[PDB]
Structures are given as structure tokens and as C-alpha cells.
């Protein structure tokens, strides 16, 4: 359905991402989450991007 | 629309019965709701699968106000 895929990308400049879904119409504003980067081995901010 | 359709059988029910000795981890009952609840040394999973957390003999009983069936355990 109208429920597209997205990378969340780490703010430490490892190119580690999580991938997840988002409704683009009902929420336009960009998704920002703390999550565990396993390369540096810390919790870190992760921001939206294109899959 | 007419008929023709059914799902695959999910092989629920009790697996280990009272008396039967188990190893921690062993599933004791798969089930949709909580027909049975967890007592001593027993985990409710997330699909309400009930499993041993210790080795021992399975015990069923009834308890409490509402007369609910608890599976618990007697660690040998």
C-alpha cells in the first residue's frame, strides 16, 4: 500500500542503516530516532533517507 | 461468493501433561488465548505459549477467585 520504505542512517559516519516504513502523505516531516550503531558500539541519532 | 476455503491446522493444545518431566525451555501448552495461565516456573510467551523455566514435573491446578487453570511445576 501507500507505505513506502526508507533508510534511517547513522550520524556517526559509518554507513550503517536501519530500514523501515513510513506513510509519506500523513506524516511529511523527517523521522529522527536514537538507535544502536553496532560499528562504533553506541546509541546515536539516525535520520531519514532514500532506500 | 461461494465456499471452498479453510486454513492450515495450527497443531495447538497441551503437549506435556501433568506428571510428565520436562527440561527448562520445553513448551507445555500452545494456545490462542490463556485457557491456561502460568504459575510457578512457567513463562507466558508472546503468543501465550507456556514453557518451563526449570526442570521438573508438570502440575496443573485451579486457583484464585475466578477458578483459572494454572500450570505450575515441582522442581525435583
Amino acid at each position: 500500500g501507500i507505505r513506502e520504505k526508507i533508510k534511517l542512517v547513522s550520524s556517526a559516519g559509518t554507513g550503517h542503516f536501519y530500514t523501515t516504513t513510513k506513510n509519506k502523505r500523513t506524516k511529511p516531516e523527517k523521522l529522527e530516532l536514537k538507535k544502536f550503531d553496532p560499528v562504533v558500539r553506541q546509541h546515536v541519532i539516525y535520520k531519514e533517507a532514500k532506500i | 461468493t461461494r465456499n471452498g476455503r479453510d486454513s492450515e491446522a495450527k497443531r495447538l493444545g497441551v503437549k506435556r501433561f501433568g506428571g510428565e518431566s520436562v527440561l527448562a525451555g520445553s513448551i507445555i501448552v500452545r494456545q490462542r488465548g490463556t485457557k491456561f495461565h502460568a504459575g510457578a516456573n512457567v513463562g507466558c510467551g508472546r503468543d501465550h505459549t507456556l514453557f518451563a523455566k526449570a526442570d521438573g514435573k508438570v502440575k496443573f491446578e485451579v486457583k484464585g477467585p475466578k477458578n483459572r487453570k494454572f500450570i505450575s511445576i515441582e522442581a525435583e
Binding site: 530500514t19 523501515t20 516504513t21 | -
Partner: protein
């Protein structure tokens, strides 16, 4: 003449110490976002071949 190895099989199975066969698990190439971490983690290590499918792989890999 010599027997010819089935070359597909060769690229997907590999022989072990006691004569079994390891193989990569299926379901881990794509359509991943939806699969739960746990599911994907348990698929990552290589697996041995089941007792009822060794005949089908000893046929394909007779020099293995």
C-alpha cells in the same frame, strides 16, 4: 566415460569432516525490511543437509 558433476550443486553445497554437506540458508537475499531481526540472524550461519536429502546431493556431487 567419467561421471559429470552437476555444477549447480557444486556452487551450493560443500563437504564436511564426517561426509555431510553444508549449505547457505534460503530467504536472505531480498525482501528483508519486513523480516524480523531474529529471523534474519538465525538464517545467517551455514547449515547441514537433512538426512532425507543426502541421496539427492550425493548423486549430483559424486567427486565431492
Amino acid at each position: 566415460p567419467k561421471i559429470k558433476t552437476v555444477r549447480g550443486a557444486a556452487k551450493r553445497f560443500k563437504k564436511t569432516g564426517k561426509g555431510g554437506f553444508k549449505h547457505k540458508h534460503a530467504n536472505l537475499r531480498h525482501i528483508l525490511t519486513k523480516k524480523a531481526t531474529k529471523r534474519k540472524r538465525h538464517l545467517r550461519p551455514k547449515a547441514m543437509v537433512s538426512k532425507g536429502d543426502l541421496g539427492l546431493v550425493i548423486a549430483c556431487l559424486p567427486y565431492a
